[PDB]
């Protein structure tokens, strides 16, 4: 291992604004105390979550000083920032090294030539998250762009000749695959090389594919002089005989591509990347095909923040979230609304999740955000290029007037996406139900955020909606890319309409259950919906607003913002999606009954269950909306206390669930 | 497929010497009838086999005239002779294209630049097999250098830029192995390119390794301008992970190495070579290690003549010798005493034999053959470099005075081999039995020829010998490079001592047998003999002499010169070595019995056997010198026909060996 | 110093052939009187220089008898002969110790084991210098192979185990260098070890690099048992940080390498070798580069014979020749046409002279010299491997029909050199002016001998020639490897055309000068002549012909065969190449003036000078062909005598040259 890659998150100091305009007064602030801070860090962990309309949104500086030894001579040095919100500028000994716009993509710069080796060197990052009309997202409405260096920073050292590390901060290696099947698959490996010296250098580029297990499947080696003039691009092609296909969750098989730069027989640099051999196809009105086989697209969504941590997460948090996402039986995630961690993306390769990635072109257009949107779209693609999990790039979400501009912008994003990577689908999302909205049809897939029975019409209205779409647009690939409802666990009641006035501060868990129960059943029976994505896997922060009696919270989670509690619909989905045995009674949290003659619901994916209200078995059980949904229609409750217990069996094994409801007066 | 390589064996005429000194008479000989002939050809096939000390040795001329089309314009044209005995000159329309001395190595000369295209051209090859002090072998005493173009001739057509056809007649690629084990191996591919043009040329060298089954493993690619000034050399480097190793007869796995030169993304030249990944190591005292595992070295030897063909053989012939070697259960072969056929070495790679390859420096030194000796060594190695099967190069055989010189010479040879291929062992062979002969120790491995009980002392003196040697020099890698006895199938008897005059004309089959039955059992027990090669798998011509009552014949083969009859030793080794069932009564050819009460030997590698005399099981069966060796002595013979049937069953199959004897009165053929 | 290397030139007796053919008569000859003689010695010093086409080439025997004490027992002894013309055979007490072919390379042989200790032993050497078709050079046309033991002989004493003294007579250690720059250089040392005894021996090999001043700057040490079986090789590698680069004449820095073999914490053997760290490189069309910097390649040649002595030279003579080379301003020497003395090579290493070593494959091919040619090139390379000053190995010089053969040869030689020393260039030399010659381009560099105005065309034709090569073959490395004109001092005239009849017996010094004056002017302005080499720094014997009114002499020397007079052109080159003050008036030997109105030519490499006719400054001084060239026309001569005084100054010293002619009537020796 010749390349050196080390964590650089340690020993930073931080000074937050706002800063005075007078230089006399500014210099004082600068000279004052800096707080000592660990990366990942952010300044909105509290003020973007605890209240609404009240969070700091401007500049902050980060400072660090660091010895660089003399053995770095003739080496090249790099800083690679995984993520900084939202604009950043790095200075090394006062010299500007790089600047970036976009609080969700990585970036690197060569600092080598600005260091004084054998000395101490001062690194400084100016970070600023105030919204500007030329950078997406343009406002903080749907969600807030937590400020600061909220993903890890790396030090990267290489030789004078290297696999480029500053190609949009990409790995510098791009793998593509063509004509993929059980029988073969042509892999192409394109590598970008750079010779920072002044003379041509004799080198060897050796690209190897390894099996998951570690065997050499193939080798392609090339000797040549590496020009010092410009970065150079080299190709390797491999013909894979009977490749082990990456088959989503059943068989997430991953080959390993290793790319080595060699000089005088020795490795001077190397990059490794994953290779999940597979093919993705969408046939409109039919569905999604993985390597030719129809594949279930049970979609969920996930934001990169945790209660308390803001978006300054570690790997346990991404892992913990992916575990939940797996356990509920999801097969596809829509990581809205912006590029999310690469570590997270790599886990999806490994885990077998088929996933969707997006740029934060959301909520409003200003007319000034194109160059930056194109720019964010490209860093996303180039940095995430090699992940088999990825199937589509998301262009925009809920952007409208000026229509003509919004459609031009979307068109050019689609176009960049296909220049940059013609092998994947693109997608874009509208908030309106109708197809021919002036802003639609600019991508491969048209996506629609629908929330029947919550913002518009009633829960059941989803059916006539979808049926009418496929009747008029049999050929469009359509996805339902957002749906669900809020659920404040403190809010409980069995008196429910088919809609809910989302203006009044009462978000009853049970209305969420009711929405997913019915709605999932429509989706399932309408293949024309190629993929559906419930919103959202967890509750996340929304600093711009207070609703449903808790501030700055979107409570549409299947799980609470702190990750501690799973709502009813969690077990509904897992009951319908997972192969794992679920046996679940609805409404454990609605423990102070309002009525005498109640309904009892139980979820089971392992057979007709038995329920025993207070010692004794009820009956009349019947089916709900799906063969996993069981209902007892007219249950008569005892005063004081009641005790519900449920029991089914499979594989000579026995499953339990008991809740405890309370009743007295009404 | 860019390179045209086609047989050039047809339409030659021959004209043997001797030739008059007088131009008048020579001109006549020259203008007379030439014999139309076919290659491979020799002129000694008969006179070197049928009669002792009387065979022609000198000049002979071959001629052939060939039309070469205008299509060769801009192309390169070569001739490649796989072997000519013993010195060669080749003329193209009168212009001298090349010279070669050494009747055992390939040679090639470019000739394109001499052709008249669109016209007819004349090739003459002058062949001479007269012994001369500056060329090995320096005499015809040990065997005879059959004259003639006795191996096949090839015509090779190339482009202006190519992989060199002309580097000691080698393939032009050189393949190397370093650090070989289960887990990995470093493979180097050295390639030589020649641009015969006047300006550099844009080309790409692409080298590939395929698996035995045709699947690509790795490619190395390089683009550059091929310099028009001197041949050039390029290296590829592959790193195999968990290579499938080449494991002798158990698993002779062969990768395919392909080197294509390209121009305009069009292939313009290729060369394909085998690759057998393996490590050879010898540890004095312990034995021979193949990829870390001990490996039996049951060795035989093989000259390259057949009765009646001389050395002008065809592949079918080489294969037939190889089949037999395989079938006797051999695992190593010493191809004495000279470079042999490439098809041959090649087929060993494929069969899994581990082989020893040798130059004809032998019998005598004269002191004027050093340059030639080195030249043949180098060619043997370069032409043979790539055969996974070769583990050693043999420097000399039984050369003595002048000691100082012969030692110098061996030293330069050992050294030349380390220079040209430091990855293989070198050996040299002494006729005497003592380690400290003033000519020994100049190579990696010391071999010794020992014919105990035949030229020297008793059959059993081999034991004391190996016991002393191993004690006194526990550290020398040492091999028994030759042992055995003559056997004239026409000679039989049971009156055998423990020695055999070799000066009388009675070389009885029974005595050879007796030698191998015993000596094998000593070799088997002393790993200090790192390997043993018996002499010989086949009888061969020795035109110099008449021993044993058959003129010009060495009769120590386990099989007869015409390849038609296996002797008893054939089956003795077979039983001792092979793992195919063997059940064989000896003396089937000594059917005219002398004594009424005699012994009866049977060979069995599949359990102690039953032997019925005239329908009546015998008893007394006792152990010979190895677990496959049983004798019942003493049998009492009936008069007239006696029938020995041997039986033994193994796992639902039963085996059977029946021979017929005849007795009437007591005799003794030995007292003649 | 564990090893004893002592001089062995003393107490030798000689006895030239031809020798009677029948034994009685020969035995008488043997018992005749032998001439006692001092080594170095040739028997051709006389008949190869004093007259043409009449020298003795044939056998001669030397004989020396010697006492070897008992204290030599268990030790090993060797003879090393630096050179013998041309084939040798050495016997010790009438037993063949060794044999050699080629009169320009050392050979060696271990004689110890044939010695009889505590006694007198007798060494005998047979030398033979008769041309043969299998030994290069195949004839004596270009020069004669003075016969006999014309270079020193050494007796060498060692232990049982040593750094081999017998590997092609090389030093036994080989030093390579890779990736060389100011920053650093990796040097690999290779060492060959021999264990003469019967048992493994426990040794330690300690390799050290010392600065020119004596400071241990790298040590590599190893311990291991030295196997008795075959000679062994050991590598050492030194990463030299910021090495002092050998930079030609600017600064010929030399580390030295010391290889010590030790046993029981003691030293048993040692060889020490030079190490001139530098990189050489040629870029066709641009020039010659030395550690990355373009370097002038001002070249001359030198044969290894002196008037009177023939080739039996001592060190003083080599030294003498070198000084005149250094002094003339030379930066590179071509030692045509054969391996030359190791002292000579060594001294180039010291003066930082950059040199080209060569094998005498010249004039003719016979078709039978290949093996010997290879042989000589190998010994030349191995023997001179370590010399920093050598940058190229020359393979052949003016050899033509049969082309195909000659080309096969050149190619095989190129390859031998690439095999044996892949780091140096190779070159071959053609007499023709055209690039696409059938035997050209088989080596890294193409050198061409060109004598315009002498063997063909005018003196000025070297201009159109070089202009067309550089245009037509921009990519080829091209050296002008010979050019010049004979110059016989006795001959003088100003009647000079553009070409000269080399065919009649007048070779006027004047014509030589006129050539070089113009021709060096052209050479200087075409970088496409990477290097040029004038023929010849010295006149030399050519025993076969009588050219230009003197037997057996090539007279293109700058200096004379006895090393006494410097011809005009000598100084012409000192001006153009030298750092030193030079002022010189041409034609100081052409005093018998042929014309009243003549031209005076002066050479200053330090400003426009002043010329004085009798006593009155001359006028009209104009510029000649290079900046150091000044000419006066048309000076009028007095009657009787005139005298000429040139004068010029700088840095406040005076420079002054005076010669003396005399008009006396209108002459014209040229027509006479
Ligand atoms: Cl202010
Ligand atoms: Cl595809
Ligand atoms: Cl390379
Ligand atoms: Cl005659
Ligand atoms: Cl190995
Ligand atoms: Cl590996």
């Amino acid at each position: 291992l010749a390349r050196q890659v080390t964590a650089f998150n340690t020993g930073w100091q931080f000074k937050k604004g706002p800063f005075a305009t007078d230089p006399m007064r500014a210099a004082s602030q600068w000279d004052g105390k800096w707080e000592t801070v660990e990366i990942p860090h952010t300044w909105n962990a509290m003020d973007m979550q605890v209240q609404s309309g009240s969070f700091y949104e401007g500049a902050g500086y980060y400072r660090k000083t660091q010895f660089f030894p003399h053995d770095l001579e003739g080496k090249r040095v790099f800083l690679r920032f995984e993520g900084v919100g939202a604009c950043a500028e790095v200075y090394v000994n006062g010299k500007l090294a790089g600047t970036h716009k976009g609080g969700y993509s990585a970036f690197a710069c060569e600092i080598g030539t600005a260091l004084k080796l054998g000395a101490e060197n001062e690194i400084i990052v100016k970070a600023d998250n105030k919204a500007r009309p030329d950078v997406i997202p343009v406002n903080q409405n749907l969600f807030g762009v937590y400020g600061g260096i909220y993903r890890p920073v790396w030090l990267i050292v290489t030789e004078q000749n290297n696999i480029t590390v500053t190609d949009c901060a990409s790995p510098g290696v791009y793998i593509t695959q063509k004509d993929v099947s059980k029988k073969s698959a042509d892999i192409t490996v394109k590598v970008k090389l750079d010779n920072a010296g002044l003379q041509p250098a004799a080198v060897t580029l050796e690209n190897t594919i390894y099996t998951q297990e570690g065997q050499k499947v193939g080798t392609h080696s090339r000797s040549f002089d590496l020009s010092p003039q410009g970065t150079q691009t080299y190709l390797s092609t491999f013909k894979l005989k009977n490749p082990h296909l990456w088959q989503g969750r059943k068989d997430p098989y991953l080959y390993k591509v290793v790319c080595r730069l060699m000089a005088d027989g020795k490795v001077i640099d190397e990059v490794v990347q994953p290779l999940g051999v597979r093919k993705y196809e969408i046939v409109a009105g039919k569905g999604f095909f993985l390597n030719g086989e129809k594949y279930s697209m049970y979609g969920v969504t996930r934001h990169q923040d945790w209660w308390g941590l803001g978006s300054a997460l570690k790997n346990e948090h991404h892992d913990f979230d992916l575990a939940a996402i797996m356990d509920v039986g999801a097969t596809t995630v829509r990581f809205a609304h912006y590029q999310q961690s690469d570590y997270l993306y790599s886990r999806c390769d490994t885990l077998g999740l088929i996933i969707w990635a997006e740029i934060p072109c959301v909520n409003r257009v200003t007319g000034y955000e194109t160059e930056n949107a194109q720019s964010q779209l490209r860093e996303l693609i180039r940095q995430s290029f090699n992940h088999p999990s990825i199937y589509v790039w998301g262009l925009h979400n809920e952007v409208y007037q000026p229509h003509e501009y919004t459609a031009a912008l979307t068109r050019s994003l689609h176009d960049l996406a296909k220049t940059e990577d013609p092998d994947r689908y693109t997608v874009s999302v509208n908030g309106y139900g109708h197809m021919d909205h002036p802003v639609n049809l600019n991508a491969d897939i048209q996506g629609m955020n629908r929330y029947f029975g919550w913002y518009e019409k009633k829960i059941q209205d989803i059916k006539p909606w979808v049926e009418q779409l496929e009747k008029d647009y049999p050929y469009q690939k359509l996805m339902l890319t957002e749906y669900g409802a809020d659920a404040n666990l403190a809010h409980q009641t069995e008196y429910l309409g088919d809609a809910l006035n989302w203006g009044k501060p009462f978000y009853p868990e049970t209305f969420q259950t009711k929405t997913h129960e019915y709605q999932w059943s429509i989706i399932k029976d309408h293949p024309y919906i190629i993929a559906s994505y419930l919103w959202n896997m967890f509750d996340f922060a929304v600093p711009m607003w207070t609703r449903g009696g808790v501030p700055a919270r979107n409570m549409k989670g299947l799980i609470t913002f702190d990750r501690k509690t799973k709502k009813d619909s969690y077990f509904w989905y897992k009951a319908n999606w997972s192969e794992e045995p679920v046996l679940y009674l609805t409404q454990r949290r609605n423990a102070d009954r309002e009525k005498r003659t109640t309904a009892v619901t139980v979820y089971s994916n392992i057979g007709t269950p038995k329920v025993y209200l207070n010692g004794q078995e009820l009956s009349g059980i019947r089916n709900g909306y799906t063969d996993v949904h069981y209902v007892f229609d007219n249950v008569s409750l005892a005063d004081g206390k009641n005790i519900l217990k449920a029991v089914v069996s499979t594989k000579g094994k026995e499953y339990t669930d008991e809740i405890e409801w309370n009743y007295s007066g009404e």
Side-chain angles (χ1 to χ4, degrees), chain A residues 20-22 25:
Chain A
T21 299
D22 185 79
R25 270 176 252 95

Side-chain angles (χ1 to χ4, degrees), chain A residues 451-455 457-460 484-488 491-502 506-519 568-569 587:
Chain A
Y451 284 99
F452 291 101
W454 182 273
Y455 291 136
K457 292 146 144 56
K458 293 175 205 150
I459 292 176
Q460 306 69 186
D486 277 83
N488 183 347
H491 291 174
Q492 306 292 319
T493 161
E494 71 213 78
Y495 304 94
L496 299 176
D498 291 333
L500 186 100
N501 177 39
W502 65 279
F506 180 69
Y507 288 163
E509 173 165 5
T510 65
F511 187 84
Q512 181 188 71
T513 301
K514 203 196 188 197
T515 291
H516 291 296
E517 270 161 12
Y518 183 87
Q519 282 186 9
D568 273 18
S569 336
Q587 303 208 1

Side-chain angles (χ1 to χ4, degrees), chain A residues 4 67-77 115 117 157:
Chain A
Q4 295 173 57
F67 195 75
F68 292 91
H70 275 112
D71 51 350
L72 287 168
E73 204 41 301
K75 302 259 162 316
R76 302 174 67 170
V77 184
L115 293 183
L117 314 181
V157 186

Side-chain angles (χ1 to χ4, degrees), chain A residues 48-294:
Chain A
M48 259 182 197
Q49 308 189 330
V50 172
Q51 58 217 18
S52 72
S54 212
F55 52 88
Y56 179 70
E57 154 176 42
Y61 290 81
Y62 288 94
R63 182 175 52 191
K64 166 181 197 186
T65 141
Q66 174 82 42
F67 195 75
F68 292 91
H70 275 112
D71 51 350
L72 287 168
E73 204 41 301
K75 302 259 162 316
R76 302 174 67 170
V77 184
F78 294 97
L79 277 187
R80 199 173 178 272
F81 296 83
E82 281 187 48
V84 168
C87 296
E89 326 181 329
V90 313
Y91 300 87
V92 356
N93 303 304
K95 279 149 174 162
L96 180 70
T99 60
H100 184 264
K101 297 184 306 162
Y104 307 95
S105 44
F107 61 97
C109 13
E110 227 173 310
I111 69 180
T113 72
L115 293 183
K116 339 153 23 168
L117 314 181
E120 264 171 9
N121 296 257
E122 173 149 67
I123 305 316
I124 296 177
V125 183
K126 222 274 258 287
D128 187 318
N129 68 326
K130 191 167 186 192
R132 338 134 44 104
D134 61 320
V135 176
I136 56 174
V138 307
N139 56 54
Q140 311 272 19
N141 290 178
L142 273 4
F143 62 95
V145 192
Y146 303 75
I149 305 176
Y150 76 98
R151 298 182 182 139
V153 197
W154 302 93
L155 185 52
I156 306 178
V157 186
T158 74
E159 306 295 326
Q160 187 97 129
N161 288 102
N162 74 23
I163 294 172
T164 181
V165 346
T166 57
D167 185 28
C168 298
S170 91
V173 180
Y174 302 92
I175 304 140
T176 48
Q177 51 208 267
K178 225 165 202 322
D179 311 294
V180 177
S181 42
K182 215 181 37 173
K183 340 217 60 206
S184 83
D186 297 294
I187 310 326
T188 293
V189 179
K190 168 211 252 98
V191 191
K192 278 165 187 189
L193 292 169
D194 190 71
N195 168 19
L198 301 175
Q199 302 282 346
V203 290
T204 288
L205 189 50
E206 186 180 294
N207 305 322
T208 313
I209 313 197
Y210 290 89
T211 62
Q212 206 161 212
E213 317 91 30
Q215 294 312 97
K216 286 179 149 142
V217 180
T219 280
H220 180 268
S221 203
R222 209 206 287 271
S223 287
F224 53 85
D225 290 335
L226 175 57
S227 180
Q229 293 190 276
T231 294
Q232 307 306 130
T233 302
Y234 289 87
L235 290 182
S236 280
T237 61
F238 302 88
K239 220 290 231 335
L240 251 21
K241 148 89 144 192
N242 304 150
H244 204 135
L245 304 187
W246 184 87
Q247 196 59 44
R249 286 186 61 166
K250 298 139 304 165
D251 199 5
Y253 187 90
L254 292 181
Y255 294 83
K256 167 172 134 201
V257 182
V258 180
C259 287
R260 288 165 172 120
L261 196 60
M262 284 161 73
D264 196 72
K266 309 164 23 164
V267 191
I268 60 165
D269 191 15
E270 81 289 322
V271 164
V272 3
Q273 291 291 289
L275 173 55
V277 183
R278 52 69 179 127
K279 170 190 217 181
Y280 284 138
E281 204 189 347
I282 293 160
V283 178
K286 271 260 303 189
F288 191 97
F289 296 73
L290 183 56
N291 299 329
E293 338 226 61
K294 200 182 170 317

